[PDB]
């Protein structure tokens, strides 16, 4: 299921199976995806015209990767930066593939936990079509206290058509999204 | 073990299991090595003053993973370049988290399957030093009929000291230190 809600109050599934996982292109070393999400990253990329401009960071993330990248941001940037910018292990949409940290393709000295990616042409240009193909931006500038992730203008999760088109167009989290649908499924 | 030989005839065991991880520094993504590979690597950009010049492409995939790039070089790239640069799933020294592929920064181009890392100063540098910090160039330009893959400028493999010096000062491969150390207690 693509519209998966996963985060530090729905962590995955101890006995979930693993997602589906292909190579995705326009980045700079191995990053893996689901299928589907590589295949509308790279649509979306060619339509945009962005091949040049923008690479994929960082895509697929084991429960074990994603613990000692939280343990290396706890001892590099203390525990109130790291609970503000990464997903604990286990809470993470990276330990599904559904989810993709963007960054600038000549952004030299890049951070690992905070990819830059605002004020270009190029970011703008994105935030403008991911939505059209399956994006939506995970985590907004005023939703700290609903998704319990601060702003984070580099992370993308795929969930698909219209339901990006729809979300983004309400300026909405995917928190928001299932209570909306949870609502209206009584009737 | 860090001086485990891993190749087309030798095989990882299904029942291996996996090694310890740690992030590793001098990157811009998210890379994983066994920790004292990580040490290792960060001691020696240190050393050299490579920070601005060089960082780390790749470290550790899982056997999935290095099937997938397996997978789409395949497709993307065909049988032949394939088979020179990519090691098959179950063959590759990534699968332990010993291998780091290195590649230069302020770059405009590299392919996915081979970082630039050559016609450079910093690359110099880099092959003078880094034998003395446990690593050893994998791949040698006239040794692809021994190791089976072709000439990777950019792949380094942790053994650890004195093996990594051992093996540069010769100009062996890992395959032919284990020769020399095999033919050593062959005459005991
Ligand atoms: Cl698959
Ligand atoms: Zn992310
Ligand atoms: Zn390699």
Redesign the interface.
Known sequence: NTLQLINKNHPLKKNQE?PH???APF??????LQPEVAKQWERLVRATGLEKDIRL??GY??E??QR??W??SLKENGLAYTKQFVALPGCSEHQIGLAIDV?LK???????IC?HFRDSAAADLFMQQMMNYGFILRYPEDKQEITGISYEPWHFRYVGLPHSQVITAQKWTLEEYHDYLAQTVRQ
Do not use: A, F, I, N
Not at 27 to 32: F, G, I, K, N, T
Not at 106 to 112: N, S, W
């Open positions: 693993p996982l292909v190579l980045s700079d070393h191995d990053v893996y960071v960082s993330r084991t074990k990767e000692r990248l343990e290396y960054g000549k952004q030299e000295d890049d951070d690992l990819p």
